[PDB]
Design a binder for this molecule. Structure first.
Ligand SMILES: Nc1ncnc2c1ncn2[C@@H]1O[C@H](COP(=O)(O)OP(=O)(O)OP(=O)(O)O)[C@@H](O)[C@H]1O
Ligand SMILES: [Mg+2]
Lengths: 212, 335, 246, 233, 94, 99, 134, 198
DNA sequence: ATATATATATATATATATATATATATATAT
DNA sequence: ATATATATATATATATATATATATATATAT
């Protein structure tokens, strides 16, 4: 009959869109924020109406995607109605390092609470110090001023990732943080035991990762 | 303040529970002995030799020993965490059982230590309150009170830690399981970890970047810029403060009236405000009359009450001078 | 020990006052004068110097003390003249150190009766320098002029042994005053500042402030974190138990 | 966990009760109108003692309430407080907020102001049953105790050599009579408290410093003239 | 084992605070405050207060002077305790 | 003048507009046990001497409640005072209030 | 229903000629205590007059209702303001009851001195009356 | 549940694009016939829908619709630069009556650049580019580039419709009236706009 | 090194819903 | 023929939820 919700929309999609949690979740998602198991309310909301939201966002030419780890996010298409952007190479270095810390048992004593200094130490341990510094400044040669600049850049990138939900600052401390399962996306190029150059082509084809 | 002291100084450069039990027994015996000695009483020298030399030194030393034992357990806690962390590096999927055992034994050790601590904390506290009660047996026992005030916290503090440490470990334990339930379940062979490490090392040989939604920010209108008020105000600067002095004429008048009126209280003579005011106002010019009447009344009403005021019969407005001044008051009888 | 004291209060370009300094008493200082003389204005200027928090500052009449008047205006703006104004306090520390704290006030041009406040501090000022003069430049025949914060900074910097500082947050200003034994409590948090202003405001209007009596627990008894921790511990335990039950 | 909680609250309450009771003796029978003395009464609330008891010993008996998915922890606590001790008759405030209020130890103490009005003994101080001067004096007493408490708490942080300044205010002092003002002066001086008071007329001619202000219209604006005053001449 | 004057003074202040601490627990939020005060007394600013404090705390932890425990609820999300060697060094003078 | 319990609330001069804080209105404590009276005398433009008044009683109970009863009187002699009407000049030192 | 009332169509304000400045809206925050109190008194007498004017046409032409007002803690006012008030109330045939703890001594009108004491184990208020001065 | 007509409005195929452009801050005027008609029809509900986001859906007196974020806005907010409002006010002025004979609704970046240079004060120009600058070629080039950037930003907002080509020549929409000042009886629009600019 | 934009938290005032206590008119027992 | 109990209406004031404004930290950019 007329004046009937089913005329236009499925009942569950309308209920989800009228839920109090919908607006904050939508704003965060459109901003690019990833959703992990920690946000129990938002995560559960996504689980309940996962299909309604994927079909809704399909209207924007963007895929609501749930990685096998269980964290949802958005991947815009080339015809996205919502703009799209790509992380910096330094962002990739730090994201891979965070995935390592999530999986690293050596730091288990930290119990998940990490400081930017430790992150920087691990990063420099595994990466190439000066050749990585080259990107921070083209005229770097190990100068401690440029060293501080790299530390500051790492801090800025860490803040940005926090904005993306990959990391949470502690309720009172912005100098300490806790990692989230979303970081697993930084390993999507190695989660499959195949040739790296084919996984890279597959990913770029899927829109998962552009080159530089 | 200790900073200057350090600066001028210029200096620079056993987990067994049977132990804890035996120290606890020794402490109980010594504390009971000291409490009984204090309760018995004695002179200043006896009070000293029974409550300040034996008690002070022994209790301080053995509480410090017990605290050191707790610190040794804390060190062992740290070492076992480190041992677990190293083990998971060497066995990965095969150390799960080993780590679970180690967690179990550490938790059990913590339970026994807490149990032993609480096995005597209450009674030791009771003995300390007994010593507090007996402390007041002399006026020179002030120092004792300090110990009876200090040795409290340590004990309680110790017991607090015995749980707080545990509060920490039961937390850490959980985290470890989560790791095993999360880190190694999806990396049973650990291959993903090595592959990630090599990818990190050789990332820039194939630099790739992820895509994320980057919706635009809602640009807004900037509020109007705020401009203060500048006028270069100028003006004469104030001169030096002048001064004025207070007139004590009313004080003199009040003294006169009080002296003239004290006689009524002295003789307990019934005071009639009408006649007294009428008589006294004759001594002053009319403009001052009011300022007189008031004062006199202020002096008169402090002297007893008027009994007629409980009769329910209102008093009349008796004239007290020419020009039309009137007063309403009953006679003051009860001084 | 010798407690610090408030020596004097200086008012610049205020409503009615061009540059006036009242020397305080060790125990009691009294002000008299007919209605609207400006006594209320004086207390307002003081408290502004003490707590320049614009949010807390609200000058209700003694009548309707705490009763919403819907005026939308805190009453501070109309108490100031156009241009720059100052309010400063000299304090002798228990260390017998003469420190001059103060605030520059200035009306904001516009229909909104809004004002700007900038706190500041001076240490080591020679005892012979009076604030009235220090804040004014004698221009013309006996016609001293007021000078702005930049001019004041230049003047002070030129003199030796005096430390001038300007604060970007009333928080740091409070921290410094507390450091110099000016404030009994350390106003670390905004709630601290609110409680402080509540105390002084109640004193100003005098008598039993409803807020004070209602929050006597808070104002007298200190906060304890251990109880909070124990409660949180309970909370975690209960949440786990509910998880298991579900 | 519940037992430990109850225990720590009990200890904190006892410590604070003792501290406040010791502080009470810092007052010396102030004279304000018919008010002859001011005092602070601190007492654990039996309605809350029962709650503590249940929490410490009979937590399990009401697990039903705790383990209800509908109730949050604060709401669970509020509902429990309701279940037992239902005669208190709390108002329409939401269970949520009352629960959090319960999450503060200080709430568990009744903290009241007592006054020795006339010869009626100590009575609870209610503004609705006190003369203006009496209320003003009572307040000033409360504020002085509060500032003392704040100073004492900060004793640890502050250096040993600095004693913070002390200063309060009172506008429209004309509301007070001479006796009350003298009482106030003796109190403030005993407490090394500076005071700034205002009244149209000079109510305090014989104490402290005094100033007299006069506003004059002057070239289409206003100027205030200040003149010093002196007790005797 | 290497304790400059500032590190040693920080250790002594920590011990004093622990002695005056109610329940014998020290969150890093207070350790940083103690380090700020000691460095202020010693009048030296090589870097920011926070970086120096963090470096010193880590140095003593690795030098077997302090024990750190991860507790999120704690102020600073960590709890520090004197180690037996640290206790000995502090009470050697005290 | 206005014998209405709902409106009558003798808040202190201070807090002239602030909330109740407590429950009491402040009237009960201003009375004494027993029967009390409050009366006005008025002379109209018609020059009629009218005595309006109210009887008050502290309602015994857990709470501080008061009972008020209005009344009016006309035709009184100008020579008789209200206190006389409401009080009996009994032989005792102090008079007696009558209901 | 709001529109149904003519009064709502009207905007009402109180204005004061403050000092050298012209007429300004009386804002409680922009005035000193005495000024506010006096303005309140003015408005009160205005209301009384309006109510009498309204009620007269329903009342006998020879009925002038009694008019009487209060002012507690009058000490907040200076002598000048108090005299202005006395003149105003007189000019409006309006009776005043003002309370002052001895600070002010208004010569004109009736004055009542009060003192509280204990007598027969009971509080009593000794009372004295003066009048006719001036 | 949900209001039925609100549900109808959300389902409309125009909703995704319009929602994205609104959340981007774009102003929908009378030119966008479909979007403007849709908003006219479904305003009563989109106002509520965007109030769920602590934002206000405002229909200007000129008619164009837009979103005003509150302090509690759930949509990441941002603030226009000083140069942005200055350029906006310049266009609002240029939405003039003689404009019809001047440019017939089509302006070029040079017109805006020259108007801004001649009309604005030097101190604000330096504040725009940089304080330490003083009348230099590089500073002027950066100023022109920033002018171009803010012009693009306004285009993003729908204030300015570029004439389709790489060259910078555009037209001014009515929504620009947002930058304008209020109009009173008998006030000269030129005078009030210039007084605002001054 | 410092101006500026952004996010967060708190106090404050508004507006609305709602329960409480009292006053007034009628009913019904004495 | 009277006085008490009921139902109604009303203002009080209590609490909540909202919206605003200010201060803060602090992360960026020149
Ligand atoms: N914000 C303001 N805007 C306009 N006039 C003001 C403002 N604040 C004060 N005034 C006026 O300045 C004069 C000083 O008032 P203030 O209350 O300070 O004086 P006072 O002597 O303490 O008076 P009172 O004892 O009656 O309160 C009065 O005329 C007051 O109206
Ligand atoms: Mg005043």
């Amino acid at each position: 009959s007329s004046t009937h919700i089913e005329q236009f929309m499925p009942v569950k999609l309308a209920q989800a869109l009228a839920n109090s949690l919908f607006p904050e979740l939508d704003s965060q998602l459109r901003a690019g924020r990833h959703i992990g198991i920690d946000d129990l309310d938002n995560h559960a909301f996504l689980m309940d109406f996962q299909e309604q939201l994927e079909e809704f966002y399909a209207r924007y030419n963007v895929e609501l995607i749930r990685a096998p780890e269980g964290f949802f996010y958005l991947r815009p298409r080339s015809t996205t109605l919502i703009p799209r952007s790509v992380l910096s190479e330094l962002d990739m270095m730090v994201g891979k390092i965070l995935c390592y810390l999530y999986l690293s048992p050596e730091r288990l004593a930290n119990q998940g609470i990490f400081t930017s200094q430790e992150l920087y130490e691990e990063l420099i341990s595994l990466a190439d110090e000066g050749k990585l510094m080259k990107f921070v400044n083209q005229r770097s040669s190990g100068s401690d001023l440029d060293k501080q600049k790299l530390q500051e850049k790492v801090r800025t990138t860490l803040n940005r990732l926090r904005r993306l939900g990959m990391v949470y600052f502690l309720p009172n401390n912005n100098n300490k943080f806790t990692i989230t399962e979303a970081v697993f996306r930084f390993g999507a190029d190695v989660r499959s035991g195949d040739d790296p150059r084919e996984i890279q082509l597959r990913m770029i084809r899927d829109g998962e990762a552009m080159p530089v | 303040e200790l900073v200057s002291w350090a600066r001028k100084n210029d200096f620079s450069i056993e987990f067994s529970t049977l132990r804890l039990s035996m120290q606890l027994s020794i402490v109980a015996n010594e504390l009971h002995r000291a409490a009984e000695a204090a309760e018995e009483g004695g002179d200043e020298f006896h009070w000293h030799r029974n409550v300040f030399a034996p008690l002070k030194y022994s209790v301080a030393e053995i509480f410090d020993s017990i605290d050191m034992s707790q610190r040794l357990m804390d060190e062992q806690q740290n070492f076992v965490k480190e041992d677990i962390a190293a083990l998971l590096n060497q066995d990965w999927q095969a150390a799960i059982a080993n780590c679970e055992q180690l967690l179990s034994e550490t938790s059990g050790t913590l339970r026994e230590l807490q149990d032993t601590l609480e096995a005597a904390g209450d009674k030791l506290q009771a003995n300390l309150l007994r010593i507090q009660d007996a402390n007041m047996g002399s006026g020179g026992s002030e120092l004792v009170d300090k110990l009876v005030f200090d040795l409290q916290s340590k004990l309680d503090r110790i017991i607090s830690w015995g749980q707080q440490a545990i509060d920490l470990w039961i937390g850490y334990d959980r985290h470890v399981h989560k790791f095993i339930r999360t880190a190694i379940d999806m990396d049973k062979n650990r291959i993903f970890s090595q592959r990630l490490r090599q990818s990190v090392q050789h990332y820039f040989d194939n630099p790739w970047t992820l895509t994320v939604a980057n919706a635009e920010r809602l640009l807004d209108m900037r509020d109007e810029e705020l401009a203060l008020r500048n006028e270069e105000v100028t003006g004469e600067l104030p001169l030096e403060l002048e001064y004025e002095e207070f007139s004590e004429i009313n004080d003199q008048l009040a003294a006169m009236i009080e002296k003239a009126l004290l006689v009524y209280q002295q003789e307990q003579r019934p005071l009639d405000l009408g006649a007294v005011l009428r008589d006294y106002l004759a001594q002053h010019p009319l403009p001052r009359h009011f300022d007189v009447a008031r004062i006199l009344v202020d002096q008169a009403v402090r002297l007893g009450v008027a009994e007629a005021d409980f009769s329910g019969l209102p008093a009349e407005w008796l004239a007290i001078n020419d020009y039309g001044a009137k007063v309403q008051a009953h006679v003051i009888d009860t001084y | 020990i010798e407690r610090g004291k408030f020596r004097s209060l200086t008012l610049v370009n205020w409503n009615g006052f061009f540059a006036r300094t009242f020397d305080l008493d060790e125990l009691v200082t009294t002000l008299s004068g007919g209605n609207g003389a400006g006594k209320s204005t004086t207390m307002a200027a003081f408290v502004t110097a003490l707590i320049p928090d614009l949010t807390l500052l609200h000058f209700r009449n003694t009548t309707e003390a705490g009763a919403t008047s819907g005026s939308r205006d805190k009453g501070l703006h109309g108490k100031l003249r156009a241009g720059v104004c100052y309010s400063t306090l000299d304090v002798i520390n228990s260390r017998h150190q003469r420190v001059v704290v103060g605030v520059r006030l200035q009306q904001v041009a516009g229909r909104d009766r809004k004002v700007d406040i900038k706190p500041f501090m001076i240490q080591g000022l020679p005892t012979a320098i009076q604030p009235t003069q220090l804040l004014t430049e004698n221009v013309g025949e006996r016609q001293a002029r007021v000078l702005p914060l930049n001019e004041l900074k230049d003047r002070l910097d030129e003199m030796e042994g005096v430390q001038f500082k300007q604060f970007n947050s009333i928080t740091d200003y409070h921290a410094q005053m507390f450091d110099l034994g000016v404030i009994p409590k350390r106003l670390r948090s905004a709630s601290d500042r609110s409680k402080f202003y509540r105390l002084i405001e109640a004193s100003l209007y005098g008598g039993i402030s409803s807020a004070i009596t209602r929050s006597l627990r808070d104002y007298l008894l200190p906060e304890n974190s251990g109880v909070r921790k124990a409660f949180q511990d309970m909370e975690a335990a209960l949440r786990e138990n509910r998880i298991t039950l579900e | 966990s519940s037992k430990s909680v109850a225990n720590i609250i009990r200890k904190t309450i006892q410590r604070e009760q003792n501290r406040i009771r010791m502080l009470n003796q810092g007052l010396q029978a102030v004279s304000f109108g018919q008010v002859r003395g001011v005092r602070l009464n601190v007492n654990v609330r039996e309605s809350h003692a029962i709650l503590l008891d249940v929490l410490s010993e009979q937590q399990e008996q009401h697990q039903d309430l705790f383990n209800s998915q509908r109730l949050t922890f604060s709401e669970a606590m509020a509902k429990l407080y309701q279940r037992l001790n239902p005669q208190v008759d709390m108002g329409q405030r939401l269970p949520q907020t009352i629960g959090e209020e319960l999450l503060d130890y200080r709430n568990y103490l009744e903290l009241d102001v007592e006054v020795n009005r006339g010869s009626d003994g100590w009575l609870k101080a209610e503004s609705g049953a006190l003369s203006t001067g009496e209320a003003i004096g009572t307040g000033m007493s409360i504020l002085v105790m509060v500032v003392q408490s704040w100073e004492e708490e900060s004793r640890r942080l502050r250096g040993k050599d600095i004693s913070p300044c002390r200063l309060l205010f009172l506008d429209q002092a004309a509301r007070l009579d001479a006796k009350s003002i003298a009482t106030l002066f003796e109190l403030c001086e005993r407490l090394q408290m500076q005071l700034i008071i205002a009244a149209p007329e000079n109510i305090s001619p014989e104490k402290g410093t005094t100033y007299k202000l006069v506003r004059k219209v002057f070239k289409n604006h206003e100027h205030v003239h200040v003149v010093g005053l002196r007790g005797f001449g | 084992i290497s304790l400059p004057v500032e590190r040693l003074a920080f250790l002594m202040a920590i011990a004093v605070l622990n002695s005056e601490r109610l329940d014998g627990e020290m969150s890093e939020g207070e350790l940083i405050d103690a380090f700020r005060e000691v460095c202020k007394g010693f009048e030296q600013t090589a870097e920011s207060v926070a970086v120096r404090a963090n470096n010193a705390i880590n140095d003593m932890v690795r030098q077997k002077l302090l024990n750190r425990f991860t507790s999120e609820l704690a102020d600073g999300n960590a709890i520090y305790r004197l180690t037996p060697l640290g206790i000995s060094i502090s009470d050697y003078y005290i």
